[PDB]
Amino acid sequence: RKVALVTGASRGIGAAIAQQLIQDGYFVVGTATSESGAQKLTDSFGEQGAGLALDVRNLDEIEAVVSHIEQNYGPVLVLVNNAGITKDNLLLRMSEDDWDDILNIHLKAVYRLSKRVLKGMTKARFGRIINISSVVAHFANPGQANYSAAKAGIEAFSRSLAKEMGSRQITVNSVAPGFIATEMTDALSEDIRKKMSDQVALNRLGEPQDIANAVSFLASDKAGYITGTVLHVNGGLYMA
Amino acid sequence: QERKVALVTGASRGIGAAIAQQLIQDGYFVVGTATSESGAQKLTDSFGEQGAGLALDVRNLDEIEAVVSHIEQNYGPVLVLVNNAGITKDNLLLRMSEDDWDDILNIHLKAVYRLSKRVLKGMTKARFGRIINISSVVAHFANPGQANYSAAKAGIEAFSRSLAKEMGSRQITVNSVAPGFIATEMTDALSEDIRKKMSDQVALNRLGEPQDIANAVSFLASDKAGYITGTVLHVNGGLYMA
Amino acid sequence: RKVALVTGASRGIGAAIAQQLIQDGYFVVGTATSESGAQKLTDSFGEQGAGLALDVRNLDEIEAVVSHIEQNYGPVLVLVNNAGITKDNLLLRMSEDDWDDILNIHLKAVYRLSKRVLKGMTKARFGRIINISSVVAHFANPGQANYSAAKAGIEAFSRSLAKEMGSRQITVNSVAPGFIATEMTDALSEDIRKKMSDQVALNRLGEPQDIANAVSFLASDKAGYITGTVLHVNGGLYMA
Amino acid sequence: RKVALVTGASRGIGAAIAQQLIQDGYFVVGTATSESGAQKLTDSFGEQGAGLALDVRNLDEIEAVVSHIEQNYGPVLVLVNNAGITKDNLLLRMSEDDWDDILNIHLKAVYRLSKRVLKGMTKARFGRIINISSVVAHFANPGQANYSAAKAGIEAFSRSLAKEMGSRQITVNSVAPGFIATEMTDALSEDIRKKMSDQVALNRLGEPQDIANAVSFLASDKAGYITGTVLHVNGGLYMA
């Protein structure tokens, strides 16, 4: 079984992606922010995956995790960079930390993990790098300058890497979710959530499985001629 | 008869044929259209139990209405519509005639307007629908001599966004698939050298295949793409990245 | 004194463009839909322009008008294709004539007039084709499928023609207005117009002079290295 | 006079921008990487500007420079963020420092300087933030993942900030140069430079003045209804 690495697989979009790639036939290593989180992933995946703890802000941990996968399971041939943490603020309340942490978790992590898996994909002459971006990289809102800059940077990074790796048949793409229902949108008010769905042409929030379906498509042999693109999964919230 | 009905225009060969065969594999009853009766019979022969062939000149409103009415009477409402046209009439602007302009805009863009309009009722009633328009990399990646084809394909993509907004509340999705350089009977006929200059522009360093486009259409037509609408799915091997 | 042709120059954006290009030093031929309209343009422009009647749906009139300009004033070296007529309708209610007329007035006219001025620009080693597009070619809303398709077609047409004419230093660009105040938006309600400006980051409708400023920039020697682009003038209604 | 701050004004695009804004009537503070560089700027600008040394990687220096301008000349009402340094490499050879330094010089500097000038623009009910991006944020090439990600991040940052500041009539835009002739491209071979111009529809490299013209347009009252956009100045190298 080819190995897929899905960061942030504990819940929501990351969990749905990891479960779908298992259904597709991959051996899935999912990462969590803690050891207890990783054990819960290990329990859930059984025979067909493994859970590992990973702080994606940490280069040493990134390297230790990929080395561990290589030693125990095989080369990482599908990499899904999945982060959703936000630190929103209007610009003159947006601190240095709020800026730096979001750029590090989202964009620097994509640079570091993509770099680290290139060797094994190159040797296999097969690879899928699939980056979770956001509608926000294209549909501007106040208070999200750091998240928006990080996600747009990810999409541009992906285009340049797609050009570098294309001749060896490795594809590099992004999936850009719109408003996806999560445990915290469940926590929002009824009214705030309606204000969200009224902007969506399909008139509803999406589900984590919608994003997992798009990632599964790109990771499969049905998408072997797609590289350097953004796959928008937002119900018509943003159309391009 | 009891499967959902898909209508694929221009299904005789290449991308259209691959789309029609893939949607049959997916479980749709596929009506494919050809430019002549003998072409339609060959589609009928190929599809058997799981589709039908009909002759259709997509420049003709009367034929568009007769074909969809025939499908409604004999098979069911059109719930997946794939608008597929590939004819070109390239020329630098100084040599591009009124006919060269009008015919390309009519075959590509007007046909999308007419056929989309005609299937809206049945999709609305079913509260399910997929309209999938075959666009082109050329709507975004400019090159000389294609002003009519490029304008038509870009118009299709903008049309699709408008219609996606109109139909979204009824869960009908409207999307485009934009092929890059796809190998066809006609690129097979080109020289070795001309075809190399094509693939050297592609990041994956090869021409695509009709099945690559069929795979993308199949994805969008499925329940795996129910939250995707108003988008362009680029299938060009990195020839154009957006 | 170089000749500029501005279609639909009677009022609004077209009038502001024509007056600005006169200030810039061009001899401006403006067109109107009737002879009395053309005479009003002639009166307004005086020494520095002329008014002509032109139905842009008519190839014979397009040819007669450009030939008349060539015979009496000089080659058309700046062409501004300006049309604003709409025939909005949900697709259900959008007739063949509503579709055909909008595509003919907006997109076919750009094809016909651009084709007709190429010779003189080619011979002069200088040219500006500036097409008035719209935010609507990019920012989708229901009921405008014909207008949106026509404007997007214009932008794609312009890219192809920019590639064809670039070696001879002729530039081909589009200007895409957002919500611009007109006699027609003056007539709307107070509430409807507020519902427009609240979507604009600058929190106001634009003015015809804003579009004239953008056209003037592109028509000048300050924009000689800009071709095949869309210049968005929408106050942040749409950002790309 | 209103004060404009142009970073990296010693040569090339930055120098042309600074000289053009002086011609437009601004008092221009230009920055250089050293004190001797700043003195040269002071000598060149005379009565109509000043030179200051600034390492844009340094928050303390950014704060000291803007405070110095506020104390001696007036509020910064036009900010031009101009950086061109590259640290290209295929991803396996792209070090942590190559990534971090480019993201800091280009994108973090835009965040820090934009944040620092917001107060004075807000108080004046007038402002222009103009960020020098690049064609590379859109036209992917191998070996530039860091530069491309930084420039795309700048464009997304600008859209978010344009939404935030729009009601106060402050505009935030980017100018994206293509292949512009520099001291650097003068040094390239004849053949390599031809490889560049053959990709340009206008069949030539641009000049620093072409970028200065675009910045001058956006900084003027001729562009008061343009915000959150990218102005592409690339001769048709990339068309959108």
Q: Which residue's entry shows tokens 């061009």?
A: C26
Q: Which amino acid is at A9?
A: A
- C218 phi and psi, to 5 degrees? -65, -35
Q: Binding-site residues of A for NADP(+), please?
A: 8-11, 13, 33, 55-56, 82, 84, 147-151, 180, 182
Say yes or no for a CB contact (<8 Å) between D142 and A151.
no
- Containing domain of residue A163, as a range? 1-240
**Which chain C residues contact residue A138 at CB under 8 A?**
240
State whether residue C230 is helix, strand or coil: strand
State whether residue C216 is helix, strand or coil: helix
Number of compact structural domains in chain D: 1
Q: Binding-site residues of C, please?
A: 8-11, 13, 33, 55-56, 82, 84, 147-151, 180, 182
Residue A44 to chain D, least CA–CA distance (Å)? 34
Say which experimental method was used: X-ray
The number of residues making up chain C comes to: 240
Say yes or no for a CB contact (<8 Å) between A107 and D153.
yes
Nearest to C172 by CA among C112, C110, C233, C123: C110
Q: Which amino acid is at D212?
A: A
Resolution of the experimental model in angstroms, please? 1.8
| Chain centre to alpha carbon of residue B113 | 13
| Paired sense of beta strands D127-132 and C76-81, if any | unpaired
Nearest to C83 by CA among C101, C64, C69: C101
Judge residue C191's burial from the number of C-beta atoms within 10 Å of its C-beta, 0-12 exposed, 13-18 middle, 19 or more buried.
Answer: exposed
Residue A206, beta-bridge partner list: A180
Beta strands in chain D (DSSP E): 3-6, 27-32, 49-53, 76-81, 127-132, 170-177, 230-233
Chain breaks in chain B (C to N over 2.5 A) after: none
Residue B45 to chain C, least CA–CA distance (Å)? 35
Total Cβ atoms within 10 A of residue B26:
18
Residue D191 to chain C, least CA–CA distance (Å)? 19
Give the sheet arrangement for strand C127-132, strand by strand.
C49-53, C27-32, C3-6, C76-81, C127-132, C170-177, C230-233
Residue B161 marked ligand-binding: no
- C36-57 burial, b for 16+ CB within 10 Å, e for fewer? ebbebbbebbeebbbbbbbebe
Contact B161, C140 (CB under 8 A): yes
Task: Tell me how far CA of residue D78 lies from CA of B108, D3, D71, D150, D213, in angstroms.
Answer: 47, 7, 16, 22, 15
A-C CB pairs within 8 A amount to 4
Say yes or no for a CB contact (<8 Å) between D166 and C203.
yes
Residues C108 and B206: their CA atoms lie apart, in Å, by 36
| Paired sense of beta strands D49-53 and D76-81, if any | unpaired
Q: Which two tokens stand for residue D53?
A: 């040394």
Q: Is C225 a catalytic residue?
A: no
SS (H, E, C) chain B: CCCCEEEECCCCCHHHHHHHHHHHHHCCEEEEEECCHHHHHHHHHHHHHHEEEEECCCCCHHHHHHHHHHHHHHCCCEEEEEECCCCCCCCCHHHCCHHHHHHHHHHHHHHHHHHHHHHHHHHHHHCCEEEEEECCHHHCCCCCCCHHHHHHHHHHHHHHHHHHHHHHHHCEEEEEEEECCECCHHHHHCCCCHHHHHHCCCCCCCCECHHHHHHHHHHHHCHHHCCCCCCEEEECCCCCCC
Is residue A22 within a helix (H) or strand (E), and if so which, with residue range? helix A12-24
Active-site residue among D26, D147, D225, D238?
D147
